[PDB]
Amino acid sequence: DIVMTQPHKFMSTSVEDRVTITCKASQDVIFDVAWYQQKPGQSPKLLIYSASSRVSGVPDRFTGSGSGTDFTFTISSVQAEDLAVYYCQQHYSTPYTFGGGTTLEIKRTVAAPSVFIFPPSDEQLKSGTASVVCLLNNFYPREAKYQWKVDNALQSGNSQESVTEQDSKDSTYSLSSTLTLSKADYEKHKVYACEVTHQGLSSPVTKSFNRG
């Protein structure tokens, strides 16, 4: 009923920098807003409640402010262990509702995706299916665009993707897309292509193969 909106799914910072995450409520919630931190693999952890009250033992670099519908959460000097997802929550009235979360990521030098395409294996083709895989490897920033083209025809609705968490050692992302066709449909075409664009790329990169 009350919608908490965090406008940025991701925010980029550098260690020791100052970062402010915002949260907008759809209705006035006085100043009854909490902030949770969630590191990968772990459960949420309360940092701030009633907009500005910090939890005992939470480091003093964490701060909250605001009232009405507009709330902020501030880290004074981002430490490396502060890289995590942050959620606001109104605790003004049931049903208690959370913002969509904001992932705090580390800034680093632009790195273009290294693109690789993988045809389906013979073992899999014998079973009746063809999975074609496109890999976009070790890039930054996170926003990247790819397209599946079969015989120079745009593919839509027949591929799934997933992206790694920002790497903890080189601060890059990687992405993997699987295009899945019937062995029949796979055989109707010749050239299988994955085409990638990105801030680090002067010109789109295409990796492709010819079936067999």
């Binding site: 006085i30 009854d32 952890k45 799934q160």
Partner: protein
Amino acid sequence: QVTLKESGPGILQPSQTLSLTCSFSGFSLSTSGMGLGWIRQPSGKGLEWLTHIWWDDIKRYNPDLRSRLTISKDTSSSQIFLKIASVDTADTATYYCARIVEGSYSSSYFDVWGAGTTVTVSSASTKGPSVFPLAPSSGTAALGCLVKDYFPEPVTVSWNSGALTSGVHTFPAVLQSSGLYSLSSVVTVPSSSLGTQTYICNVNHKPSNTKVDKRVEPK
């Protein structure tokens, strides 16, 4: 010194009833200003409050699910319980037990969270994966393993029995429309290794007691 530990059934089929238990120490659910409740999180998504129960047995429920939720406490063994009736795939999530407290200004914030228990709702049968090579083409080469058609999560993937770790990316699994998961694990290696080094992905799917070791070689 507050501890909360969730227990549940791991896997369920659609229309079954999920029963979760939370065992707690380090405080009494009998002291005023104290409550205990449940919050869930589907994989890669945000948080959804479900329900909580106060020290004086006042119960609160998410209205979109009240017709399927039941919460209850048993102080005598320091436990609370959640029932979610006729589950469906949307109820697949990690379920956290969480202590809700009352302050002097306001209240309904959760100051201690358990580690969570994962629940998958699916009519799929337990099934180990098929592992297909992602063969290096013809600097840096990439190769990998497509780990396809398994249920349930999770699989673990290592390379050369743990010896190869740098450059490995094991991607989050995706759920195919068949109800079976698929994931890829890749690694980038020196091209100058391809004729001499052997590359094997070791896939462990504990739910089916299955290990697959698949050699990936150029074609």
